[PDB]
């Protein structure tokens, strides 16, 4: 979990409501192959708001690659423990994947 | 592919650049179990823009369920054939999942 960056303190919503989905998200979306600069996401509804998860290949080029499931879990647990309004990070600075855990206003039926 | 509705929204990105990801999206995201009103998505970069895909459990309740992989492919291929700017729909009016294919401005690095 380096870098690990918290979202700003102006958010309404607390990451504690989202941490229960970390295993489900990491288990289901990290085995996929992601081209450079592509992402995969899930949205989960909770009481009063939603939880948005992201896995993102930060590489600019190179081969499409799958992500590490245990690194996803390590990073997102660190964000849930250190960042009350959610956060994002990598397992170490040379790693290609970024993982994010983001509590947000609204629901999962919007933007499509 | 009923209901099947085209996007009609001032965007001028052609769905034809996104159709190449239909199989990859459906194959990777439909085997996941989704709670009622939850979604999964993927974003793919293409020349000049991006392609946003969604699978969404429209049920209000019931137990979490997975989606049909061939139904996902039928609905998205219908939208790609009938909707030049993308679209969204269900396999028939009683089915729980909605699938969407959305050629959009931008990249896959925004809002996380
Ligand atoms: Cl709705
Ligand atoms: Cl049709
Ligand atoms: Cl329509
Ligand atoms: Cl409609
Ligand atoms: Cl509608
Ligand atoms: Cl809907
Ligand atoms: Cl509704
Ligand atoms: Cl058709
Ligand atoms: Cl027809
Ligand atoms: Cl037709
Ligand atoms: Cl709709
Ligand atoms: Cl529709
Ligand atoms: Pt509709
Ligand atoms: Pt149409
Ligand atoms: Pt709805
Ligand atoms: Pt048709």
General description of the model:
The structure is a homodimer of 112-residue chains. By secondary structure, the first copy, chain A, is α+β, with helices and mostly antiparallel strands. The first copy, chain A, has one domain (2-112). Helices cover 20% and strands 31% of the residues of chain A. Chain A contains two helices and seven strands, in the order βαββββαββ. The first copy, chain A, has helices spanning 22-29, 69-82, and strands spanning 4-6, 33-34, 39-46, 49-57, 65-66, 87-89, 97-104. In chain A, the strands form two sheets. In chain A, strands 1-6-7-4-3 form a five-stranded antiparallel sheet, covered by helices on one side. In chain A, strand 6 (87-89) and strand 7 form a beta hairpin. In chain A, helix 1 packs antiparallel against helix 2 (69-82). The relative contact order of chain A is 0.32. The A-B interface holds A 28-29, 32, 35, 37-45, 52, 54, 56, 88, 100, 102, 107-109, 111-112 and B 28-29, 32, 35, 37-45, 52, 54, 56, 88, 100, 102, 107-109, 112. Strand 3 of chain A pairs antiparallel with strand 2 (39-46) of chain B, so a sheet runs across the interface. The site of one chloride ion has 2 residues of chain B, from loops.
What class do helices, strands and sheet pairing of chain A give? alpha+beta
Amount of helix of chain A: 10-25%
| Run of helices and strands of chain A | EHEEEEHEE
Based on DSSP secondary structure assignment, what is the total number of beta strands of chain A? Answer: 7
Strand order of the largest sheet of chain A: 1-6-7-4-3
Radius of gyration of chain A from the CA trace?
13 Å
Overall tally of domains of chain A:
1
- Outline of chain A, from the CA principal axes? globular
Q: Span between N and C termini of chain A? A: 32 Å
**What fraction strand of chain A?**
25-35%
Largest interface: A-B, 24 and 23 residues
Bound small molecules, deduplicated:
chloride ion, platinum (II) ion
User: Regarding quaternary structure, how should these chains be classified?
Assistant: homodimer
How many helices of chain A? The count is 2
Largest sheet of chain A: 5 strands, antiparallel
Pfam families (chains A, B): GBD_Y3 (PF22803)
Organism (chains A, B): Coprinus comatus (Shaggy mane)
Disulfide bonds (chains A, B): 6-83, 18-51, 26-72, 43-108
Domain Glycan binding protein Y3-like (chains A, B): 18-108
């Amino acid at each position: 979990q380096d870098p690990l960056s918290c979202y700003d303190n102006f958010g309404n919503r607390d990451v504690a409501a989202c941490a229960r989905f970390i295993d489900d998200f990491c288990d289901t979306l990290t085995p996929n192959i992601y081209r450079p600069r592509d992402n995969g996401q899930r949205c989960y509804v909770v009481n009063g708001h939603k939880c948005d998860f992201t896995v993102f290949n930060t590489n600019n080029g190179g081969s499409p690659i799958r992500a590490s499931t245990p690194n996803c879990k390590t990073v997102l647990r660190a964000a849930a423990n250190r960042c009350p309004t959610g956060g994002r990070g990598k397992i170490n600075p040379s790693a290609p994947f970024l993982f994010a855990i983001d509590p947000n206003d609204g629901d999962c039926s919007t933007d499509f």
